[PDB]
């Protein structure tokens, strides 16, 4: 197994312009959406076929009721936050919780809040304490840190429950999440502005999206490499690239994907 992850996001919007839910929730395994809920449908629904086929209807019924509750919690906290800040009008409140299971056997877990899309409160499950970015966050910090049992509960959830959900969903979606589609890599040479040769090394067709690409001179490290984003091709695979300039030493593109290494010599 490669590194895998489970993440749940919440998004609250006070005073939303028509057509924007006041509350949206979405879970992910790796890059794949698995679950969704919002304040318009007021239902938690699967977003992936392997989630729908493996989780009985009483699962979605139970989490429908909790998200309804959690939407009301988010509405009320946003109101208090705005009161602390003395903010009128429309503002956003966000939460991310999740965990990772890396190849190493070692795990991670995290829990974070943002207000207006900036860091607000960061939980440390190893010291069981919240980090506050300012004095309003410091007030909430004191409230949450005074409930000792609640911090122990979060630590337990990140370290045991979250990892066990992830292992469950990996088995459900293993045919999607554990597969490998290797990349197609090509190198393109071209003289650009007079006397400037750009080399592009370009990859597509691959999955998982994680991929390593770099340029090397004579077999040792490279100058300034330009990196293209890993982008979804819309068919379940990904694409990316890396480029350098030379002018006229000989170069090679090096690609790493799912434990297979590739060299393209220019």
């Amino acid at each position, epitope marked *: 197994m490669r590194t895998h992850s489970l993440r749940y996001f919440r998004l609250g919007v006070s005073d939303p312009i028509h057509g924007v839910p006041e509350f949206i929730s979405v879970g992910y395994v790796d890059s794949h959406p698995i679950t969704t809920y919002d304040s318009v449908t007021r239902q938690k629904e699967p977003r992936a076929p392997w989630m729908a086929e493996n989780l009985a209807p009483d699962h979605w019924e139970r989490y*429908t009721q909790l998200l309804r509750g959690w939407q009301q919690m988010f509405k009320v906290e946003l109101k208090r936050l705005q009161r602390h800040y003395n903010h009128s009008g429309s503002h956003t409140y966000q939460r991310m919780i999740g965990c990772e299971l890396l190849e190493d056997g070692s795990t991670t877990g995290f829990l974070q809040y943002a207000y207006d899309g900036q860091d607000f409160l960061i939980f440390n499950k190893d010291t069981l304490s919240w980090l506050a970015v300012d004095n309003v966050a410091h007030t909430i910090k004191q409230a949450w840190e005074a409930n000792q049992h*609640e911090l122990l*509960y979060q630590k337990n959830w990140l370290e045991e429950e979250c990892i066990a959900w992830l292992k469950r969903f990996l088995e459900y979606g293993k045919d999607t999440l554990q597969r490998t589609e290797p990349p197609l890599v090509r190198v393109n040479r071209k003289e650009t502005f007079p006397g400037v040769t750009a080399l592009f090394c370009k990859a597509h067709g691959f999955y998982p999206p994680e991929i390593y690409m770099t340029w090397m001179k004579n077999g040792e490290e490279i100058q300034e490499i330009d990196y293209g984003d890993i982008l979804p091709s819309g068919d379940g695979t990904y694409q990316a690239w890396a480029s350098i300039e030379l002018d006229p030493n000989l170069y090679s593109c090096h690609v790493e994907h799912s434990g297979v290494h590739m060299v393209l010599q220019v």
Partner: antibody
Amino acid sequence: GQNIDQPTEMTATEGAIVQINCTYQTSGFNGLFWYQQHAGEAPTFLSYNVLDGLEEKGRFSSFLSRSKGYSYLLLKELQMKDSASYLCAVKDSNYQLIWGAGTKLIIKP
Amino acid sequence: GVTQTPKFQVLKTGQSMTLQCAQDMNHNSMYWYRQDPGMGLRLIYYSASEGTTDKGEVPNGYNVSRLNKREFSLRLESAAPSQTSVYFCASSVWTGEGSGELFFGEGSRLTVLE
């Protein structure tokens, strides 16, 4: 989850110690609660454990081993007052409470 | 904290009745349990927050109304001798908060006779 197990009844002598066991086998774990319910009255919250160890509140203590799926409520210096039922309850992976059938504790003078 | 009525009720078979429960603790979640000899509490219906309800373990022969944030009624549609029991209303700050305890009302003893 499926099962919570705790003895039906327990008798101990006033001034001594008693340990009420609770084994749980659930699907996921999010906490173990102990409640006290006097005869003909409502249950009231005694303790909460979610990580391993022993929490002590006065003459009462509650223990949890998450790997043995196991908790006990410990009562020291028993008093007649302590006669009541003791409810064991576990939150499962979907935050539902699975309740044990309770342990009636009898104090002999 | 939690107020529940009535404490005791005799009913004839086929009669209806409503149990009332009110909490003024600004709690979001309320529950209706029945307690029967030799078994754990069984959750009939619950309300994870104002504006929503769902069945519990033994909903048949009951329904509920979360009237407002404070109040959670339980109705016996057509009292059966099997519904002879002690009924507990309970509330808690939220649902899905791991360490939140329940706060119970005093109980309603109901006996249904032919």
